[PDB]
């Protein structure tokens, strides 16, 4: 009431000037706004423009299906392969024609590596004399590197090295007493010390006839010229196809450098099945079976052993002249480096001693050729940047869990997979075999554009499911193919997807109801001729999975491809507003849009809306907006994106240059507005858009994430633009909200309706029902959408209070100025004229200096300047609501094209349910199949498909896509998320691939906990326990690899002192049990680890009330080891290390720029008057602010970090780290037994642990009963349905917040039986005892109050836990209204539709 009294103030405050507006926004102008608000929509124009769509669609179909009149299927089939072929030929000859293209013997080889695998040779990491010594009938006959590898073992006879001996016993006393010696000039640290006994420094002699810059420059200019599509690849489909058996064997050839932790998962098993006294494990099995298949498990670990020493090695200095030499731990194979291109760039030459080498190559001519030296193979120089580093660290973790999942996927079981791939007779063995080689040689060979071929299969794959009305036209993707091939795989990929063409062109996936359930038979991999059965592997065939890094990108290729996009449509501008919401196109060019039938969607929406909320539904809109802009604080836009610093500035790079650019976060232009009374983003608004008129235009700056496939491509904007952004976005989203068929703004509705559709379907009409497909792609979204149609729009649907808002966003939204990253300008200042993207970077160049006049490029000007489109993340809920709009409109109007095809009674059917989020359409059209009639519902059914993308979007510049499908009956795609009949898959690949993040949170707790949420997310998406398993096994040996189980000899001490205590803090990654490893957490480890291992006596011993917090740790010592450390458990897990590597300077210097209170009391004491479920001033705001900044992880420095320099660190320090001084006294005169009071203060929902680990606590190896038909159910069900005595919230604060429950009197009485801290007294400090929990009441709040619910798909129903954890395992309004008249004047083709459609 007063809050709202006072932002309907604020919004009276808020005034529209017209003149600055049409002064600085040009195509925003008062006589638009009043037109539209005041001019009703000319019926004869949409009677016109819907009668010539439809025409259109007609015309259309009959071309693009029925060639003719009087035509078979084979004939209509043969034209069509006719087509595809003509298509496909002309994509490969424009790749034949082009300046240069490789010759096709000349090759490639696309994974660097060599294919050794050495026996194990010789414990310990040193290059001793003897392996210098034995080595040296090199032969080297001038031949390429073996003269120099001659000379490194030369000198590595003599002593000429830094350390030709590395002794442990120095690094036991290291750890176990800290001043160990001085540091050696050599070894060169980046955090936390570096150690000239925990890695070898060694320097060898250089090089006189070669110099490794000359000879990468020389094959760089080679990588520059392309390959062509009809060089052979022959090599590579023998390597993927014909090479089963060869991949698994057990002769123990390389398997101990990444084998040594195996007592630990012994260790492991053993706190959670107790009953396996037989060593037993059950996935350990696998894991090890796996890891010991020697071909390519051995292989993996010496990817994953150089990529670990390589990254160790980035970080170390060496002096020009020489280069370091190193041994990996247990093993022949030596690695010459030389960061001689700080540029982000490591030469790397192998060298493998040939007694050591033996049993195999893994296979020949996929591998970088070796060169023989007789005593020692040797290979060539490569090269390597250091985002393909953490690739390769991670090589065995991906590689177990992309072959796990690919033998799961085709029907294998997870855990015998090693054994069915020995042995492979089935071809579900060896489509998993080539599907795992596939993902091999992805992984090996990191390529945007490689993906973006196996992303294309997608659309290739979804043209088959086309129904007979419609006819694949899967030569519609050769468009999206990529300019240039760049490798071998490209070469091999493009070729599978031209064949694949050819076959979905011959004929479709063809559809089968034989038992009442529909299925798709024809159906194949599309990278290979085998044939499939299942929808999961089809669908994860694509999908090509990611890794996630939030990383700028200075490669040019990719941010000239970032800013290409919006340039191409800034060129396309009209020049001419009289389509731009003054007059109505007849024939719409880009860009434009009709305002007669924007304000008929408009006005249908508003009469939908009417229909279903009631005659006071304005009213209704109205006041939501109001809760939203009572519920948009200050706090809520105060977060961790970054936020633009080039207003008024950094316009010209010569005042520009030598000064860097550096994006301040929102939280310091968010405090500084609320050091002022300013207590929310509308009252601060209102100034802001006058700043942003002064400025006259949006200031915005480009980032390119370093990934691929995630989220790429982001646009950070300014704090105003920020909040201008945010009022704009809650209107919209009010009103977005107030829609049933959009999904942006109410996800749970894009879950419901299409499980939904089949019951409305059968409860409406009686008997089997057809649909359509989903055009979920949307050409050029973002670029291309004017704003005008946005203002209109919202203005539309607004009460006049808020349309001075509303125009003055859009306003600023029409023209934007945005950045570009200056080390590109740099570039392009001193450049070369031979710029091979002359669409963009020679337009660049001479816009910025140069003759040509450019209408986005300005004169000596560091910004692309558009005067139209939209950026990608601004105003999404916006273009949600277009979209929305027009979909609504889509649906009338297909119910009118049902009833003038078909026949007047199709109203009574014809339900067409939609699903539209932000650029992705989807539709499916429910119609009974009675009749024979029902092939001319199909009929229309593909007219209204057509009708909908190619007609009518086109007057909203919402553009199809050729990426969009058409027609497909029992098939819908949205989001990613497909479903065929009665079954509901999603590709499950894009997670696996992630749950090997190799997380840098450096808290030691906190990164077994980012593992299980990662392991937690491929259960949810799809999955099973038994790969999720699989998974938690890679997980293991990736961070047992974290610390130095194939980095350092001192994990061979960390094992023993490891299994005297178990704790996660100390670093034993706590194993979950097999049989539920997904539902269970982190907590539910540390709950069982507390309740069998001896831990919880440490937990005895150290703990806060009989110990102290985390100024009193058991060790006196706070930093117990020279490498970093703490006891702090912060409400939480304790951990026994922090390994800190981030300086917190950066931390420190926010702490000052945020400008919040010092004392910090002023929560706890003022904690009553302080709702911390909801802000209300300034101060409070600032309060709130500070503790969303001091919350553990979200510290700058824990955000802030890289990979190889974590890794690096990760074994120089983390092996010494935690060792012999914490290890050694840990816990002396320990309570054995821990308190329960204590217990359940550790674990607040211990209930809920208790009753879900009552089932899997103690289980055999497996028990599998084979089911017959497997299929999707579309059945979900949550294990977080089992709820508390209190179904309240737990929180409770000052028994005012929630009122879900009347006079809470024994809902009072049950919380303080668990809390065993008086919940009366308004929840003071001192409320039994002060500080009970902690000296923060909102960390005692934090930690006292915490619910949940988890969620899952299941095989078959749930009646409880219990069968949800065996079923997850793995088995193996009116119509007549808007009456639209529409024109019938070609009814032959209509009848020709019908008569070759009854023919066939």
Not at 872 to 894: A, C, D, M, P, V
Not at 1300 to 1328: C, Y
Request: include cysteine; proline fraction near 4%.
């Amino acid at each position: 009431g007063k809050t709202e009294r006072e932002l309907l103030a604020m919004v009276s405050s808020i005034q529209i000037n017209w003149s600055v507006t049409e002064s600085v926004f040009p195509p925003f102008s008062r006589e638009m706004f009043d037109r539209f608000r005041s001019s009703p929509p000319d019926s004869e124009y949409i009677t016109r423009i819907v009668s010539r769509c439809l025409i259109n669609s007609q015309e259309k179909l009959i071309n693009s299906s029925f060639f003719a009149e009087g035509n078979d299927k084979a004939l209509r089939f043969s034209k069509n392969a006719e087509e595809c072929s003509l298509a496909v030929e002309r994509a490969l000859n424009q790749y034949r024609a082009e300046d240069n293209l490789r010759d096709l013997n000349d090759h490639s080889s696309t994974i660097q590596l060599p294919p050794w695998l050495s026996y194990h040779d010789v414990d310990g990491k040193d290059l001793c004399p003897l392996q210098g010594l034995d080595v040296r009938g090199d032969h080297p006959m001038c031949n390429l590197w073996r003269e120099v590898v001659t000379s490194a073992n030369l000198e590595e006879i003599e002593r000429m090295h830094d350390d030709a001996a590395a002794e442990l016993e120095f690094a036991l006393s290291g750890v176990k007493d800290r001043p160990d010696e001085r540091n050696r000039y050599h070894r060169v640290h980046l955090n936390m010390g570096s150690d000239d006994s925990v890695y070898i420094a060694a320097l060898g002699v250089n090089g006189k006839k070669h110099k490794a810059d000359t000879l990468v420059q020389q094959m760089r200019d080679r990588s520059k010229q392309p390959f062509s599509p009809d060089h052979d690849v022959d090599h590579i489909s023998e390597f993927l196809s014909a090479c089963s058996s060869d991949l698994w064997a057990t002769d123990e050839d390389l398997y101990n450098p990444l084998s040594c932790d195996k007592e630990l998962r012994l260790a492991a098993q053993r706190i959670h099945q107790p009953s396996l006294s037989e060593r037993g494990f059950n996935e350990i099995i696998t894991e090890h079976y796996k890891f010991m298949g020697s071909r390519i498990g051995s292989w993996c670990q010496m990817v994953s052993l150089i990529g670990a020493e390589l990254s160790a090695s980035v970080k170390q200095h060496v002096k020009p002249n020489y280069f370091v030499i190193k041994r990996l731990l247990g093993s022949g194979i030596f690695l010459l480096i030389k960061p001689t291109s700080s540029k982000s760039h490591i030469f790397v030459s192998f060298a493998i001693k040939r007694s050591c080498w033996a049993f195999d190559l893994s296979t020949s001519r996929v591998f970088k050729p070796y060169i023989d030296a007789g005593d020692l193979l040797v290979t060539d120089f490569v090269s390597y940047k250091l985002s393909k580093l953490t690739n390769l660290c991670k090589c065995v973790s991906l590689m177990e869990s992309s072959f796990s999942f690919w033998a799961e996927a085709f029907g294998i079981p997870s855990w015998n997979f090693v054994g069915d791939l020995f042995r492979s007779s089935d071809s579900a063995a060896m489509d998993a075999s080539y599907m795992g080689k596939l993902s091999l040689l992805t992984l090996l060979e990191d390529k945007a554009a490689t993906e973006e071929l196996q992303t294309i299969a997608r659309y290739i794959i979804m043209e088959g499911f086309v129904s007979p009305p419609e006819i694949p036209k899967p030569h519609k993707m050769t468009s999206k193919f990529p300019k240039v091939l760049r490798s071998e795989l490209q070469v091999y990929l493009l070729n599978c997807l031209c064949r694949t063409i050819q076959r979905i062109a011959g004929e479709p996936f063809i559809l089968k109801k034989k038992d009442g359930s529909i299925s798709w038979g024809g159906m194949f991999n599309p990278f290979s001729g085998r044939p499939l059965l299942d929808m999961q592997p089809l669908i994860s065939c694509c999908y090509n999975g990611y890794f996630k890094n939030k990383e700028e990108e200075t490669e040019p290729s990719s941010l000239s491809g970032m800013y290409k996009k919006i340039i191409e449509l800034e060129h396309l501008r009209p020049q001419s507003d009289a389509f731009l919401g003054y007059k109505d196109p007849e024939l719409p060019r880009m860009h434009e849009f009709s305002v007669s039938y924007l304000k008929e969607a408009c006005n249908h929406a508003k009469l939908v809306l009417r229909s279903l909320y009631g005659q006071n539904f304005m009213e209704q809109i109205d006041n939501q907006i109001i809760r939203e802009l009572s519920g948009l604080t200050l706090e809520r836009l105060a977060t961790l994106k970054a936020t633009s610093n080039f207003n008024e500035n950094w316009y010209v790079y010569k005042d520009v240059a030598d000064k860097n650019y550096t994006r301040d976060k929102l939280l310091v232009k968010m405090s500084k507005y609320a050091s002022e009374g300013k207590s929310l983003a509308i009252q601060k608004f209102e100034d802001c858009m006058r700043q942003i008129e002064s400025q006259g235009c949006m200031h915005i700056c480009l980032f390119k994430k370093q990934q691929h496939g995630g989220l790429r491509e982001i646009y950070v904007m300014g704090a105003e633009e920020r909040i201008v952004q945010s009022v704009v976005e809650t209107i919209a989203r009010s009103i977005g909200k107030f829609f049933a068929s959009d999904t942006l703004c109410n996800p749970p509705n894009k879950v419901k309706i299409p499980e939904t559709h089949g019951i409305r379907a059968r409860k409406q009409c009686k008997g089997p029902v057809w649909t359509c497909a989903t055009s979920d792609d949307a050409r050029k979204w973002n670029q291309g959408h004017f704003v005008t149609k946005f203002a209109l729009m919202l203005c539309e649907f607004t009460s006049p209070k808020w349309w001075p808002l509303i125009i003055r966003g859009c306003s600023m939204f029409t023209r934007k100025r945005m950045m570009m990253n200056l080390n590109y300008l740099k570039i392009l200042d001193g450049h070369r004229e031979l710029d091979i993207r002359d669409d963009f970077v020679m337009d660049l160049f001479k816009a910025y200096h140069g003759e040509a006049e450019v209408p986005w490029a300005f004169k000596g000007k560091t910004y692309l300047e558009t005067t139209t489109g939209m950026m990608q993340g601004i105003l999404h809920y916006t273009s949600s609501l277009l979209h929305t709009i027009h979909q609504e409109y889509i649906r009338s109007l297909s119910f009118k094209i049902f009833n003038l095809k078909v026949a007047p009674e199709m109203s009574k059917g014809l339900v067409c349910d939609m699903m539209q989020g932000s650029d992705d359409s989807s539709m499916l059209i429910s119609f009974p199949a009675d009749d024979e009639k029902v092939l001319t519902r199909c009929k229309v059914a593909a007219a209204i498909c057509f009708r909908m993308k190619k007609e009518l979007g086109v007057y909203l510049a919402i553009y199809p896509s050729e990426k969009s499908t058409a027609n497909t009956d029992f098939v819908m795609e949205y989001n990613s998320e497909f479903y065929f009949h009665t079954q509901h898959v999603r590709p499950t690949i894009r997670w696996i691939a992630a749950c090997c993040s190799l997380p840098e949170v450096e808290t030691l707790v906190a990164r077994q906990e980012e593992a299980s949420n990662l392991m937690t997310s491929v259960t949810e998406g799809g999955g099973s326990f038994s790969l999720a398993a699989m998974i938690q096994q890679a997980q293991c040996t990736l961070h047992y690899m974290l610390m130095g189980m194939g980095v350092s000899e001192l994990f061979l001490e960390y094992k023993k002192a490891v299994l005297k205590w178990n704790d996660p803090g100390l670093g034993f990654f706590l194993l979950d049990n097999p049989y539920a490893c997904g539902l269970g957490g982190f907590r539910f480890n540390l709950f069982k680890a507390i309740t069998r291992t001896d831990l919880q006596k440490l937990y005895a011993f150290f703990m806060k009330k009989v110990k102290g917090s985390a100024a009193r740790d058991w060790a006196d010592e706070d930093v117990t080891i020279p490498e970093t450390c703490s006891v702090s458990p912060g409400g939480a897990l304790i951990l026994s290390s922090s390994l800190k590597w981030g300086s917190r300077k950066k931390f420190q210097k926010l702490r000052d720029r945020l400008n919040i209170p010092e004392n910090w009391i002023e929560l706890i004491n003022e904690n009553p008057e302080v709702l911390y479920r909801a802000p209300r001033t300034g101060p409070e705001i600032l309060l709130r602010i500070a503790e969303k900044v001091h919350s553990p992880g979200v510290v700058s420095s824990l955000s802030s970090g890289n990979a190889v320099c974590k890794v690096m660190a990760s074994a120089v320090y983390f092996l010494s780290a935690t060792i012999f001084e914490d290890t050694g006294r840990p816990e002396f005169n320990f309570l054995e037994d821990s308190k329960y009071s204590l217990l359940q203060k550790m674990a607040a929902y211990s209930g809920f642990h208790g009753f879900n680990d009552m089932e899997p606590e103690d289980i055999l190896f497996l028990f599998p009963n084979i089911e017959e038909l497997e299929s999707l159910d579309s059945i979900v069900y949550n294990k977080g349905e089992i709820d508390i005595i209190p179904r309240v919230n737990i929180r409770d604060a000052t028994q005012t917040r929630v009122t879900i429950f009347n006079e809470q009197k024994t809902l009072r009485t049950s919380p303080e039986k668990l809390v065993s801290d008086k919940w009366f007294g308004t929840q003071k400090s001192r409320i039994g005892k002060t500080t009970f929990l902690a000296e923060w009441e909102k960390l005692k709040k934090i930690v006292k109050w915490l619910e949940d619910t988890p969620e899952a798909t299941l095989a078959h129903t749930p009646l409880n836990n219990h069968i949800q954890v065996r079923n997850f395992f793995a088995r193996m309004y009116d119509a007549l209204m808007d009456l639209m008249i529409e024109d019938a004047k070609n009814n032959a083709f209509s009848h020709v539709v019908d008569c070759i459609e009854l023919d066939v």
